[PDB]
Scaffold this active site. Structure first.
Site, PDB file in Angstrom:
ATOM      1  N   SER A 247     -10.208  -0.358   6.790  1.00 55.64           N
ATOM      2  CA  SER A 247      -9.481  -0.256   5.529  1.00 55.64           C
ATOM      3  C   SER A 247      -8.819  -1.501   4.946  1.00 55.64           C
ATOM      4  CB  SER A 247      -8.484   0.888   5.619  1.00 55.64           C
ATOM      5  OG  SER A 247      -9.190   2.112   5.463  1.00 55.64           O
TER       6      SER A 247
ATOM      7  N   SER B 134      -9.157   1.812   2.530  1.00 58.89           N
ATOM      8  CA  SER B 134      -8.410   2.749   1.695  1.00 58.89           C
ATOM      9  C   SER B 134      -7.333   1.783   1.238  1.00 58.89           C
ATOM     10  CB  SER B 134      -7.806   3.877   2.506  1.00 58.89           C
ATOM     11  OG  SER B 134      -6.776   3.397   3.389  1.00 58.89           O
TER      12      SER B 134
ATOM     13  N   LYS C  72       0.861  -1.191   0.000  1.00 55.50           N
ATOM     14  CA  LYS C  72       0.000   0.000   0.000  1.00 55.50           C
ATOM     15  C   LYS C  72       0.896   1.239   0.000  1.00 55.50           C
ATOM     16  CE  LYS C  72      -4.013   1.847   2.505  1.00 55.50           C
ATOM     17  NZ  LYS C  72      -4.834   1.658   3.739  1.00 55.50           N
TER      18      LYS C  72
END
Lengths: 434, 434
Positions: B171, B147, B73
């Site tokens: 997330s 996210s 990420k």
């Protein structure tokens, strides 16, 4: 006698609410030199005791505490009684009665007095220049300790059958140990602190001071408004955080504690060492609590700072000096410590460690002798208890030994929510201890 | 194929790191329009792939992840790759490599790309005006969600065998559910977030996105740097917080979840209803996280507010509008909820509840239809997950149903520190689901 004992005497008609109050008032007068009470209206008390007595005759019972005399730490508002929190400074708005107090009143208890306390609960010595110090129940020249000092002494001396206090860094456990009584700090949030003067909202705990573990269990259920089942105890396994205790105990407490661990096997219990470093926990706790406490009394500290004693005033100002960033760091650092405790408790029924490094020190003692050298009073007496209130786990304090005739308490720590198990383990130990 | 199967092919000489990479790069090219990757340097990746291939041929294994292609990420710094956090605004100072990434790299993993993410991790839609939206792996017209959106989509499409993301309010679990992959949020702090861009330091969690539960466990041990015992599963007892779920699920997910509950008994498992009110938890979480997040990006928000998208900017501003008093209240309110979760978990092996109320919705969907009526997207899709990240307990998300032909995930919630138990129960369920 204790709560359940007096309750049985009332049920069999061997005593009455009025009689119980008279004995409490008699003890209060005989031990005035201890200065345990902040407020006492004998007239109003007697009037209420008469009603409770007549009600018991007509067969009307308010609840499980009907006619039982109890006291309340002066930070919990009680109807008909003023709340001063051991300070001369003004206090933030508070209702006429704290939720926890309401629980006791609705249960039929007879709240007859407010107990002294360390100023605004910010301290553990029990010495207060505004109200005068609370003196140790066993030796009037030693500290009663704090900040539920008056409550502990009252219970020790028979001034009421039990008392309600608070514990943020050990303010229930410490005075319990100092005075030889039982003090239970339930899991955080178990007992409502609504309506009570806050110190550190995310760390404050409401809890009872009693003469026995069964009373602590009984009273906690009423205070929490829920039943807390007790399970059977056999071959209990106790974890001991030796690394955490290294150099934090006094020589005599060290010997008593070591002796206890040596005798447990014969009692059919098991002792296993566990690791609980908790590096930096002292300052994490201090910053978090002082930051919150300073904000609670910020208005009074600005408009009427003279209302606070020098020690408290300095502590509050130090809290105000802490920035919101410091607070955020402390909050995050507390969350980081949780896993450590979980691991230490995993595999054992509870952790065991002294509640104090030494017996109640002489009044005025600022420095004490630990096995690793001299240390400041606060750090020496709060380090052993603050981790468990900071992390919110149920922790019981009960007498386990004596040093030179002074009481020394033991801590029984359980996982979050294991209030019933901690109390069960506490009763098991209590029965096999002095 | 998953991590462990690929690891088996490598050991048996049926494939090489270079071949595994080429496969990942073909998939990235084929599904490039899904926009899962924020950064990809094929040359640098191939160069590393060659080195790992030759090392393996001569018996030089760097670690358990040697030669396995993984993505990261874009909030975790990775050597040789830029860190943008899905935003155009300046970011606080960060090191060259995050601690969690170092864990993967030293294990021998081939980190070949950064995945896209909802701007600064403050959001769960996966829609980003700067990078363009990350599109759902199954249907590009639907939200990949967030996210850790790019990470979940990459794993779902085979662009790398696994990925590293974060979970503050869901997330990791939300995108896993939306895209049909496995997402594990370990106990708070188990996996280091050092060197990574924080959102809410006291609520952030680092965790893996995988194709199977065995991979999730495998990778979590490496990420945590410790082994996590997996005990056998027999007659599992699952708690279901019906009161908490009341009116918060869409009709179809409600039906799928009910079906699972109906089948568990035949699968030799037990289902018990538990109570988990958590009233006001949504607001508590929101204020606490926005407050901390705003202080992280405070400088950038003042100097370059235009670097943030409107949605993110509004949330950050709401965070700056909250004072330290609001934060103290949020901190206290969080502690007040802790006992509730502990009580719900007592007596059961884990809690079960959907990870989402509905399948991933079309891009741009601001309101949705729940069994109780219309509801804003955020509250409908974050309320189910936020409690467990807020309180730091290990929570697994794995596929369990299909609605509208879209993946729907299931949450398995365990007690604090019981990551191994959660993963074991997840494996048990995975072998008995679809």
């Amino acid at each position: 006698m204790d709560l359940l004992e007096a309750k049985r005497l009332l049920e069999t008609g061997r005593t009455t609410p009025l009689a119980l109050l008279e004995e409490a008032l008699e003890r209060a007068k005989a031990f005035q030199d201890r200065n345990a009470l902040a407020y006492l209206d004998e007239e109003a008390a007697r009037k209420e005791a008469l009603a409770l007595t007549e009600e018991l005759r007509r067969g009307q019972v308010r609840g499980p505490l009907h006619g039982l005399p109890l006291t309340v730490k002066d930070l919990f508002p009680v109807k008909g009684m003023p709340t001063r929190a051991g300070t001369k400074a003004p206090l933030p708005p508070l209702p006429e009665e704290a939720r926890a107090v309401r629980r006791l009143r609705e249960a039929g208890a007879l709240l007859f007095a407010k107990t002294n306390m360390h100023e605004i609960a910010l301290g553990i010595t029990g010495e207060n220049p505004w109200t005068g110090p609370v003196r140790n129940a066993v030796d009037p020249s030693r500290q009663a300790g704090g900040s539920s000092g008056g409550s502990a002494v009252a219970v020790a001396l028979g001034i009421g059958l039990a008392s309600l206090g608070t514990d943020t860094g050990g303010s229930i456990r410490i005075p319990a140990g100092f005075n030889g009584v039982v003090g239970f700090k339930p899991s955080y949030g178990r007992v409502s602190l609504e309506g009570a003067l806050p110190l550190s909202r995310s760390t404050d705990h409401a809890g009872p001071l009693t003469r026995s573990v069964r009373d602590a269990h009984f009273l906690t259920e009423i205070l929490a408004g829920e039943s807390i089942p007790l399970e059977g105890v056999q071959n209990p396994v106790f974890g001991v955080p030796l690394d955490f205790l290294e150099g934090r105990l006094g020589v005599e407490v060290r010997k008593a504690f070591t002796r206890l661990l040596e005798d447990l096997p014969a009692l059919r219990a098991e002792v296993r060492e566990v690791s609980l470093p908790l590096e930096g926990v002292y300052e994490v706790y201090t910053r978090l609590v002082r930051y919150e406490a300073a904000r609670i009394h910020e208005k009074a500290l600005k408009e009427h700072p003279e209302g606070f004693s020098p020690q408290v005033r300095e502590a509050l100002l130090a809290g105000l000096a802490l920035t919101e960033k410091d607070y955020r760091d402390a909050v995050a650092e507390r969350e980081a410590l949780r896993l450590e405790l979980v691991k230490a408790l995993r595999g054992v029924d509870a952790l065991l460690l002294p509640v104090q490094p030494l017996p109640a020190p002489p009044l005025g003692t600022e420095e004490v002798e630990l096995e690793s050298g001299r240390k400041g009073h606060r750090e020496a007496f709060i380090t052993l208890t603050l981790p468990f209130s900071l992390l919110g786990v149920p922790t019981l304090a009960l007498p386990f030994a004596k040093v030179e005739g002074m009481p020394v308490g033991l801590q029984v720590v359980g996982a979050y929510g294991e209030d019933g198990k901690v109390l069960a383990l506490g009763g098991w130990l209590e029965a096999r201890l002095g």
